[PDB]
Amino acid sequence: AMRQCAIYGKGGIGKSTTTQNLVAALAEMGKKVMIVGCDPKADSTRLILHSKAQNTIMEMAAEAGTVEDLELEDVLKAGYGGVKCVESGGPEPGVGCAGRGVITAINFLEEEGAYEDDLDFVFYDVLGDVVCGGFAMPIRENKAQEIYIVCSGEMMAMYAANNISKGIVKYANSGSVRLGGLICNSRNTDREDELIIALANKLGTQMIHFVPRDNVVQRAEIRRMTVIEYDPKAKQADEYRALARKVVDNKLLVIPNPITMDELEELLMEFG
Amino acid sequence: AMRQCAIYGKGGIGKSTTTQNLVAALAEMGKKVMIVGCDPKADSTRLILHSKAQNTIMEMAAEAGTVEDLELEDVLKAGYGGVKCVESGGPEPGVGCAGRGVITAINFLEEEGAYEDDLDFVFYDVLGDVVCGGFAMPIRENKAQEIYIVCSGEMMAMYAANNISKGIVKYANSGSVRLGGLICNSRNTDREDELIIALANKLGTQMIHFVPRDNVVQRAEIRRMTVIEYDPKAKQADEYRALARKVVDNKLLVIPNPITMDELEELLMEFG
Ligand SMILES: Nc1ncnc2c1ncn2[C@@H]1O[C@H](COP(=O)(O)OP(=O)(O)O)[C@@H](O)[C@H]1O
Ligand SMILES: Nc1ncnc2c1ncn2[C@@H]1O[C@H](COP(=O)(O)OP(=O)(O)O)[C@@H](O)[C@H]1O
Ligand SMILES: [Mg+2]
Ligand SMILES: [Mg+2]
């Protein structure tokens, strides 16, 4: 068995930082993990690889002729803790569909046998500002069975969480894609944890962890490292270890109950 | 003549707040303006209409049978200062293409003669986290001749500005779509204005205005109002009046020069 999880959320909310640090903590624990970047920004693996970014499947397929000329051992790269990493890539802006590379990448990984029984976790890091095209494919096509949404007290971040939840509901009759929880990535504001707990309760899920805002994140990322690797003694490292333990132990996977804009506005008014 | 401008930027950066306040200031000045919402969130006109949001062309077409059963005087709604307002709408999450409603809406407005010679400005408020589908159509199909990008010192916001600029370059051989400037919507951080000026200079454009972070914005929006209408004496009202004057007077419209990720990182490092 292997657990297939996807991290969704609005742009800039902390998906890639949270995913890479969570995965580093899982590897520290002894888990075998793959990260699949599904965001055109294509920097979802740089902290595991100590790299600028990673060359994408779309780029390598073009340089090699066809995606069939690629071998899995040519694309997948291992970094901290043995974590295996791949980036989908996507068309340049104003061309085609920004999510088209995700479809190519996930089909390539499936056909080439990247999903070896020895993997314990696969994490997809997915753009969530729109839920369409290749960015909906992990939900539509049953690839990401457990979705975790990174959000914050920001109205736009909570709106995105609600929109992603509507996409999960849309495909509830096929496959087994479910909402696993919300992850609050703090803007260090008062009662922000209580706000995201309230939102989770309204959706029918839970807030799995509250990640504090900590400058050590920037100091680690300037050096192309997770906090787990950069400063294993840091308080923030222990925060990511706590998040990873709670993901491992999580048993609540639900078809969420999206809320109205009036309910969202009332939440914000109440906690402010 | 009428000037056709589009406001792009990452989600949550301040596009709709900035556009509606800028447009209220233009109306206060005596200009005739239309706002076309091109973001699936569909709340781009609520502060002009004093409303929850606005019913969308996609919704009204479905309730009426076809878009041909709609009349322009049925969709367009006027609010503060006579500003005319319309929302595109879009498919539900996980269905189709999130930008498909923009294509329907802009074609409807063109065919029904919404672009009457007496309009002075049209503003499109466009989602910019991906530049594809209907969200690229204002650029691809020559609808938004002057693009203004709302951004901030946030790395993701500057990345989005660079991505939108790449889309402009892609279509530089057809039509006349050009980058008009960057608008800094402050996270009140030190030297943030200098950072966005530097980014504008590297792209070949200018930072047209620095909009401060001001709590009066929230107090106005809780009452479904622009700051221009809510408190015309506010310092922030004068900030939006300054932005509007500089848009009116702007003569620099360029094919931008997108930068590398290394250049972007160096900017952030330098000003921090
Ligand atoms: N908990 C945190 N504390 C401090 N900085 C953070 C935290 N989480 C994310 N960041 C920073 O926020 C920025 C955006 O995070 P990122 O994971 O790249 O967002 P996304 O992948 O959702 O676009 C990065 O500069 C990152 O260092
Ligand atoms: N200059 C500002 N000062 C204070 N709050 C602001 C300012 N600009 C935007 N906001 C707030 O930020 C939030 C997002 O702005 P919005 O215009 O809806 O973003 P977008 O349309 O880009 O998604 C809103 O709650 C708005 O009130
Ligand atoms: Mg990311
Ligand atoms: Mg908006």
Author numbering:
A (entry chain A), B (entry chain A): 1 to 272
What's in the article?
The Fe protein also catalyzes MoFe protein-independent CO2-to-CO reduction, and participates in the biosynthesis of both the P-cluster and FeMo-cofactor. Unlike most Fe4S4 clusters in metalloproteins which adopt two oxidation states, the Fe protein cluster can span three oxidation states (2+/1+/0).
The crystal form is isomorphous to the previously reported MgADP-bound state of the Fe protein, with the Fe protein molecular twofold axis coincident with a crystallographic twofold axis so that the asymmetric unit contains one subunit and half the cluster. The locations of the Se ions within the protein structure were identified by collecting two sets of anomalous diffraction data: one above (12,668 eV) and one below (12,643 eV) the Se K-edge. Modeling the cluster exclusively as either the Fe4S4 or Fe4Se4 form resulted in substantial positive or negative difference density in the corresponding Fobs − Fcalc difference Fourier maps, respectively. By fixing the chalcogenide B-factor values to a value similar to that of the Fe ions, satisfactory mixed cluster models were obtained (see Methods for refinement details). Based on the crystallographic data, we anticipate that the Se-labeled Fe protein exists in a mixture of Se-containing cluster states (i.e., Fe4S4, Fe4S3Se, Fe4S2Se2, Fe4SSe3, and Fe4Se4 may all be present).
